[PDB]
């Protein structure tokens, strides 16, 4: 076998050598060297530093701001919220477990690195709907503490039904790569949880159509201000596609052929480069976005324009 | 000319358009797009939000449990500091200069960023050298009963400042000086221009022989050294292994250390070489700038091999509890001497 299955795992190594140990019990260093699971912990507290200052920063500006309540000012603060979730909740797990080579706290740690990073990346996708249309209506022209709050609830709404299934039994969340990072069961058709008919789901769902929504919104395209507004929702949107699409595209790949001769170097690139995913969004808004990098000063500042 | 030579500065551009302005007086986006300098701007502000706390929560750790001490924990604390300085003092003034295309606070903004750059770069150099020798005190069995005590981390620590401050200080006091460099938003030793009156061509033969080959000569034959016990391998004040955990560490520690500083350092002796020649912006912004994540990747190491330090920041982190020998002041740290 081109790999080792376990009933909760999968290891892209052949247990031929009678090495394979669980991601669970034993350290996966015999998967790959033991400085890039050292450098795996490093990019991780790097991930972990920077992502909470940025995001919590981004949060304390426009709670701070009284006059920041734009649907975009609402949306970018979700993504802080679930960034700081990404972060506290998944980056944790994900830090300590590459310092040991394997899943220490066990799947209880898997499913927290999984599900935080899906309920992540599945917020921003799902907020990159509520903008979308928000440039289709005060842009191609057919909102506030009002409308804003329900799009950010939705965005919850929809990420929750994808990353919150694997949690309670359609799927299941399993050690990918170097076994260091966890994300849905691509691998195994397990008959037990179908989650072959879960990525037919998630993939469609929570992939296809959320894009081409995002799509033909933006092919169906004070008043000369909106132009910078957008131009930063399209930017948000291709630096999502450049996080997810290695990821997802490696995922669908490993889908559909599986048992395959990957290695676990594969999908351990795509998936903890994704992990910017955590901190890219809140640097493209202090960027183009002259209303909060000025309103962000002033919180510096404490008043100096 | 293939560049316009100041009486402050040195432009890697050409003035036979007059568009080349003071790097004191105007922005140089004559030099290559606005967006480029945005990105320094970001760049550097995104290093002041890293190397603060990171630099700032192993500086506040060290000091809060008493009994991580040793010369490895000591020069640690030291990095931070340095580091802390860099953030500020220099990192500051950078990513101002960035941000408005070229030094708006003049030439002691040039001075600051460019001081507090090779301060940093220097405390780093020169704790690799204590470092080096405490490896060799250690493990390639010298002395005869010898052991390390808090007294010497100091004298190694007060050491490399007057080491790093020997190197930094004089193009402070005349003796060479702070030159913009790249995109002008760096400032760093003049090899630009002979300017045989602050004596240049003298002080980077200087630096380069005192400050660098050096330094290396004895952290290369120590390790050269250290080959007779531990060659290359090594899979927390526990026992055998917890001194080839924090050897195994020192010897990142210069592999880290070249990669920031040789691009730099090469890029910067090509020029002093080749003066005059045409280079453009671009050329040495990159490994000054890069090498500027020198205020940010000491501590990186330290909380990622070292198991005690590690756990400390968590039991720091944590308020107190934690869910290897315990040292943080934090879980019975009463001595245990003999
Ligand atoms: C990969 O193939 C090897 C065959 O070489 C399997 O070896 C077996 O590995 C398990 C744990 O993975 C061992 O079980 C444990 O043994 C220890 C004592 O060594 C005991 O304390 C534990 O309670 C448990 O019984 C087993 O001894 C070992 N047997 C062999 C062949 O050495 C291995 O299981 C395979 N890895 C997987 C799970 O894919
Ligand atoms: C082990 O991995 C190899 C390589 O991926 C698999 O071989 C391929 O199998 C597909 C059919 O699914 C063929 O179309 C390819 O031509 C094969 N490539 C080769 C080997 O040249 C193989 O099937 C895997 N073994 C298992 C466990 O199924
Ligand atoms: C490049 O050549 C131009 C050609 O004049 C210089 O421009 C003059 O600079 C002085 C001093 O800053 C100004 O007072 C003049 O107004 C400029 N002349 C004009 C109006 O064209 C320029 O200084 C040269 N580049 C540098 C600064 O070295
Ligand atoms: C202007 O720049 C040119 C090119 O950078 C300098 O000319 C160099 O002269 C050497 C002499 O050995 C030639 O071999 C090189 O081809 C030239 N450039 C290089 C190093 O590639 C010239 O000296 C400069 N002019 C001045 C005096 O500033
Ligand atoms: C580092 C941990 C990771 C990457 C774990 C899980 C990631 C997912 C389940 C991602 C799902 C997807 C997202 C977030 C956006 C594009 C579509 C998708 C299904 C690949
Ligand atoms: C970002 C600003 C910088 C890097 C300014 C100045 C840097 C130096 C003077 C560096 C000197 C050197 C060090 C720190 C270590 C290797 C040798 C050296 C002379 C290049
Ligand atoms: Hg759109
Ligand atoms: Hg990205
Ligand atoms: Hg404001
Ligand atoms: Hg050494
Ligand atoms: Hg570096
Ligand atoms: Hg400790
Ligand atoms: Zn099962
Ligand atoms: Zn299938
Ligand atoms: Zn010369
Ligand atoms: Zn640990």
Same mark, same amino acid.
């Given at each position: 076998?081109?790999?080792?299955?376990?009933?909760?795992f999968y290891?892209?190594?052949?247990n %031929?050598?009678?090495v394979?140990?669980?991601?669970?019990?034993a350290?996966?260093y015999?998967?790959?060297?033991?400085?890039?699971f050292?450098?795996?912990?490093?990019?991780?507290? /790097?991930?972990?530093?920077?992502g909470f200052?940025?995001?919590?920063?981004?949060?304390?500006?426009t709670?701070?701001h009284?006059?920041?309540?734009?649907?975009?000012?609402?949306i970018?603060?979700?993504?802080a919220?679930?960034?700081?979730?990404m972060?506290?909740?998944?980056?944790?797990?994900?830090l !300590?477990?590459?310092?040991?080579?394997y899943?220490?706290?066990?799947?209880?740690?898997?499913?927290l690195?999984?599900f935080f990073?899906?309920?992540?990346?599945?917020?921003?996708?799902?907020? /990159?709907?509520?903008?979308?249309?928000?440039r289709?209506?005060?842009?191609?022209?057919?909102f506030?503490?009002?409308?804003? *709050?329900? @799009?950010?609830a939705?965005?919850w709404?929809?990420?929750?039904?994808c990353?919150?299934?694997?949690?309670?039994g359609?799927?299941?969340?399993?050690?990918?790569? &170097?076994?260091?990072?966890? @994300?849905?069961?691509?691998?195994?058709?397990?008959?037990?949880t179908?989650?072959?008919?879960?990525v037919? !789901? &998630?993939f469609?769902?929570?992939?296809?159509?959320?894009l081409?929504? *995002?799509?033909f919104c933006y092919?169906?395209?004070?008043?000369?201000?909106?132009?910078?507004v957008?131009r930063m929702?399209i930017?948000?949107?291709?630096?999502?596609l450049?996080?997810?699409?290695p990821?997802?595209?490696?995922?669908?790949?490993?889908?559909?052929?599986?048992?395959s001769?990957? @290695?676990?170097?594969?999908?351990? *690139?795509?998936?903890?480069?994704? %992990?910017?995913?955590?901190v890219?969004?809140?640097?493209?808004?202090? &960027? &183009?976005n %002259?209303?909060?990098?000025?309103?962000?000063?002033?919180?510096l500042?404490?008043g %100096?324009?």
């Open positions: 076998m081109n790999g080792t299955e376990g009933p909760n290891v892209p190594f052949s %031929k050598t009678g394979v140990r669980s991601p669970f019990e350290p996966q015999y998967l790959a060297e033991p400085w890039q050292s450098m795996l912990a490093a990019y991780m507290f /790097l991930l972990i530093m920077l200052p940025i995001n919590f920063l981004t949060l304390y500006v709670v701070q009284k006059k920041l309540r734009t649907p975009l000012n609402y970018l603060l979700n993504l919220v679930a960034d700081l979730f972060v506290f909740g998944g980056f944790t797990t994900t !300590y477990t590459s310092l040991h080579g899943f220490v706290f066990g799947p209880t740690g898997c499913n690195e999984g990073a899906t309920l992540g990346g599945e917020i921003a996708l799902w907020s /990159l709907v509520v903008l979308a249309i928000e289709y209506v005060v842009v191609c022209k057919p506030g503490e009002n409308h804003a *709050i329900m @799009g950010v939705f965005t709404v929809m990420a929750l039904a990353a919150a299934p694997p949690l309670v359609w799927s299941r969340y399993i050690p990918e790569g &170097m076994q260091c990072s966890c @994300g849905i069961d691509y691998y195994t058709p397990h008959e037990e179908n989650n072959e008919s879960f037919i !789901y &998630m469609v769902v929570h992939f296809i159509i959320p081409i929504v *995002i799509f092919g169906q395209l004070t008043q000369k201000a909106e132009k910078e957008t929702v930017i948000m949107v291709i630096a999502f450049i996080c997810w699409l990821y997802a595209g490696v995922a669908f790949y490993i889908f559909t052929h599986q048992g001769d990957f @290695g676990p170097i594969f999908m351990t *690139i795509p998936a903890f480069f994704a %992990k910017t995913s955590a890219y969004n809140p640097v493209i808004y202090i &960027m &183009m %002259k209303q909060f990098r000025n309103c962000m000063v002033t919180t500042c404490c %100096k324009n």
